[PDB]
Subunit: 283 residues, 4 copies
Amino acid sequence: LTESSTSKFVKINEKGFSDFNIHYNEAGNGETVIMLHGGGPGAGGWSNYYRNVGPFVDAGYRVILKDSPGFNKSDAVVMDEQRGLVNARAVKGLMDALDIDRAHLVGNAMGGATALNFALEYPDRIGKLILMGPGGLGPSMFAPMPMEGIKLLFKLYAEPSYETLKQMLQVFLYDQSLITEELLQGRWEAIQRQPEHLKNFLISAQKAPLSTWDVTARLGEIKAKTFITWGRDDRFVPLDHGLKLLWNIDDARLHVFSKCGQWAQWEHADEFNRLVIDFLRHA
Amino acid sequence: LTESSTSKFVKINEKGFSDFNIHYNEAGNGETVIMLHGGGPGAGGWSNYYRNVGPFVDAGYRVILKDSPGFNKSDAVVMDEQRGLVNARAVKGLMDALDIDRAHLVGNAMGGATALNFALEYPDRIGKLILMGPGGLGPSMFAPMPMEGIKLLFKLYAEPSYETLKQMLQVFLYDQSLITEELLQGRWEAIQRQPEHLKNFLISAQKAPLSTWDVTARLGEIKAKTFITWGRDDRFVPLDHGLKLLWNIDDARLHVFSKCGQWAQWEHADEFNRLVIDFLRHA
Amino acid sequence: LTESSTSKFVKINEKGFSDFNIHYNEAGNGETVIMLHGGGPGAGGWSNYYRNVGPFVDAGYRVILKDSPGFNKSDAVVMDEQRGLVNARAVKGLMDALDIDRAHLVGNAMGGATALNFALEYPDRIGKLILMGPGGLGPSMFAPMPMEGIKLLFKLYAEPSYETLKQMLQVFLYDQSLITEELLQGRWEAIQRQPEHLKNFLISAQKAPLSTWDVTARLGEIKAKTFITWGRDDRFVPLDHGLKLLWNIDDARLHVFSKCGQWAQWEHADEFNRLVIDFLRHA
Amino acid sequence: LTESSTSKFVKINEKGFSDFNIHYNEAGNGETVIMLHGGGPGAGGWSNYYRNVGPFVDAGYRVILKDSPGFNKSDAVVMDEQRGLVNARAVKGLMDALDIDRAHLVGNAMGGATALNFALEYPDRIGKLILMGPGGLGPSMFAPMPMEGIKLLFKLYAEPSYETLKQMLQVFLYDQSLITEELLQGRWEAIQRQPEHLKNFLISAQKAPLSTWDVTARLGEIKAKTFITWGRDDRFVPLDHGLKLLWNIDDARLHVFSKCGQWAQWEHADEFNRLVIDFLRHA
């Protein structure tokens, strides 16, 4: 499976979105699992989840790696509401467009925020909920904020360069030897191809700062069975937010990988794939 | 499989132990997994692990549920060293007696302390290490000590009664409806059958208090792949000790169950069985 | 200064309260500091704060040790709203009745919850805010709930006895040698004198459980300079709630005493008196 | 009081040190309080503590702001042991040279590590112990390591520039408006004046990495009354290490300032001065 062979577009119509173009990569044909990426410059569905799509499709799922509005090959957008909520409306838009009644959601960082908002706004449309260091859950009890990785994310958005890209990835990943030329050129190309996105993210972050993403107070409403994952060494979203979800969501469990940054699904792909497939099959 | 049909005895000879009688329950014939129980009055191998033995044997393992010295049907003993270390010597004693070169260890609370000490003292003799709220790892950063469950454990040892037994189990378990008459009569019978054990535990705890169990400083020596589990609602050993192990053991991961006390393997048996079998097979 | 010589009553009229009798103990004549007690059976202003009233009056303050509705010699009441809010209305009622424009508030546990609610509802009427292990601030990230001390508080309310009183105080205090016959007889007399209160607290806790006290989401509104204190060894309200306040209140600081339960102002009276007087004078 | 008018030198002879030149700034003539600075490039006694020396001398103390070996105007050195221990030997060297029997110690970051080592090695020679975010106390339960501020400290040591100096100070301080041209030129001058120091620190850090500083296991030996301070927003040493000290030192208390980085004594000078003077006088 490749990016090109799985690539598709659909136009969505939900709330603020009027014939809005969403790019996604799809493979398999069983029950739908939608995977949602983080918010750093150059992020997208395929580059975030290409180590997971095959094992999940092999397990019998239909995998959709979604480009969120204002990322990769989805349409440009300036948001005046918190991104989690706006992203969640796009997921619903996508699901209505494709005649998907219910989906399992997998979400990393911004995508975790998106998945949380989806489960809150559309409880009838979600199956299980897999959350990987979800962003925007308010203050940490230990970590000064903005987090180190968040400052680097904003620096790269404002002053894009290859060197700053590299500095950011060095913070996002625990194992530095995973930072190959392929990884760097990939993200770099995604940044170069659509400069509008970087500009629009910064404008959006002015209208709705990260403090406006906090849906902590509503976590008690989530009835979806929930699997929370964290990287022990995540410098982007703090580890105690894993406890926060575990205490506040009715039916949750927490799995923390050692030697792992913000991309558990990439840095610990085999173990991640096994744990989440097992959870989707048996929890 | 029943307690009687699996029941066996072996005499051990290791360090302080001279023809010391160890009771265990054994089933299956593949690679050996030894399971080690907690330290509360009436504890033993079968009653701690009877929901795990079948699924593990079905997965192809040889399961040994060991009675630790001074518990259940193993010989009475007064210890002058920290119990974790003395227990670990007994495990080695048992393994030498049965011609077992290497074992996977599963350990809850006191049994977690035992498993840690085994991995430190006999690194050549352990496979993987599964730790469920291991006891004795020093102070908590949050929890006042002695913990609520520890005070109840000492109260029941000093003044054994059925009512105090019930109070203790109400603290050990999250879901109170799991406290059946069968569970209570079981522990009660184990207490009544061998009063010597209760007396000896209290004498042992005078010679070597819980503060002497702390092997934190040596955690860097463990090269065994390690799976750490915790109950979110454990009132016996504090949750932050899960983080402590995760930060200090080279190759560890942490899994925390919601709505779960000190017996994860019993309160969340299906998920526990799946996660640990998957880990023994694939990590 | 004694309980009798400082004792006063005032009738309050605020929201739900119609000629409601509030007992308080008053000394000094400078700026008003109102001190507010915890919620355990037998609690009251004088017995909670008699080690603080003198040093504070000597520093030049007018000290009011308030009996909260449904405690000690204040009127009996059954509350259908969270106690923090109802208590805060009584403080305002008291201040209107006595022509006090502004007060510094000192609050322990339930009294901390009361002080928080006062600062939120009547920001124009508060000076500085001193919070000692305030209750009701939602879940802990570490501590299973209900906390050990909370279970003992409810046990004593439902089955009052001298022996259960003693068990509770043994948990509330770090240093057990502070539990004199004077302390025990004091609380015991307060319990015996007004059994209606115990009954009414349990009815009130049914109508508005502790989960309804959580004002976390509004902490950003507090503009009062705030001094947060905690006992390291508090088994009633969890230590991480000190961090929660410190992160969420604009101008806060946190002071944690070692070897200290839920009554810092009593167990570490000299240091407490010095720190809070210094704060009221100079912050 | 100025840097020049208070400036002094003494030659020390203790263990490894043979006629080793130590620079310090001294004022006052009552009981000795020695203040010890952090380890970042350009650090020294006067620039770290010039907001504290006056108020402390006014309170009646003799203040000594010590330059640690390999910093500011003290002699250059390459250390093969952990810096905390080597620094502590220098403090003793200084105290023997000046006929000081006992000193109160105030220590920030590296200076906190120094103060801890002094109290452990020379318990007869210390009065009270004031610790401000002490470095080297092992892993954090929450914070990935090396900490953000530590990476910036090593970057500035290896590639000294004015721009990198500014980036580091922006992380060390919470309030960015405190970063004046005076502050920057000060640190810059200290860096330019002695490049040997920067080189030697990096060599020393190779021989004895930060992991070798961990004296956690010996904290139970400290009988000095101890005042622990932390900045809530410290990105150099993690907040949970404040809890670690509070749990493990016999007689400790913890004070955490909001809106505060690694220099509490500078960022919150008035409150810091009041709290520590009160502690030295009355604890």
